[PDB]
Amino acid sequence: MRTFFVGGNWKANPKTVEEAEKLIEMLNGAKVEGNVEVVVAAPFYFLPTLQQKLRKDWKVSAENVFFTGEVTVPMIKSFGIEWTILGHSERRDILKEDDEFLAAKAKFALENGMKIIYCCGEHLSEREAGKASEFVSAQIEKMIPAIPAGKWDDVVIAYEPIWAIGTGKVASTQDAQEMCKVIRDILAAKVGADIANKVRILYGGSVKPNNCNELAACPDVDGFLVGGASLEPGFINIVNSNVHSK
């Protein structure tokens, strides 16, 4: 039985420390139902505030980790931050973060006691070419050798349908399920069923209060990496969709 997992990615939000404090006060009062592991990723400047004020049953995450302008594992590790996102689509696409680089980063983060939300997902061209499975499989196949023995408990994988983000195309609930299953099957083929059965695989497309319950019920969807809704009152609805996941 895999514990449902919801990560809230604030991205470059909110605008001020006062707004971050108000968001934290609201999350601290949220009534969680069911069984669910919740992590909140926030800009670097705000992590100290989160680590001090956020409900201790939830954990704080970096949105990325690393010279001038860059932030490192010991600093966040030394702050008591245990999680990072890696390979988020925005960073892959906009900043050309590549797979060798990213699998290398996962290896390094895990070797240093970090837990990771490792993002993957295909673009519109590969989806339209009928190569979505092939592309995503390749991404995970590059990730797999980077995971140290004994560290699979510290890995969560997030599927981002990049083909449906800013393109004029939308993903269905079935699309989410199918691509999460693709991921689980490649894990099973390469590292075995015990690993495949315990790794949480998340849907990282558009998740809102109006589609979370339907998505949660999908058998290979173990949770969400949430964007904009993480800043809104409906984040708790998404956390609580775990009750629909068998």
Contacts with Na ion, residue ranges (CB under 5 A):
221, 245
228 interacts with a second copy by CB under 8 A: no
Among residues 88, 23, 82, which one has the least CA distance to residue 49?
23
Cross-strand partners of 62: 84
Contact 211, 240 (CB under 8 A): no
Residue 10 CB, shortest distance to a second copy, in Å, is 9
Given the residues 37, 88, 97, 126, select the one marked as catalytic: 88
Map the footprint of a second copy across residues 73-132, applying CB under 8 A: 74-76, 78-79, 85, 88, 90-91, 94-95
- One character per residue 23-62, x = contact with a second copy (rule: CB under 8 A): --------------------xxxxxxx-------------
Contact 10, 41 (CB under 8 A): yes
**Binding residue (CB under 8 A) for a second copy from 29, 69, 150, 168:** 69
Please tell me the distance from the alpha carbon of residue 224 to that of residue 8, in angstroms, as a whole number: 8
Residue 245 touches which member of Na ion, a second copy, none, C-beta under 5-8 Å by kind? Na ion
**Binding residue (CB under 8 A) for a second copy from 61, 64, 137, 230:** 64
For residue 244, the tally of other CB atoms under 10 A from its CB is: 15
Residue 8's H or E segment, with its range, is strand 4-9
Instruction: Give the residue numbers marked as catalytic.
Output: 88, 160
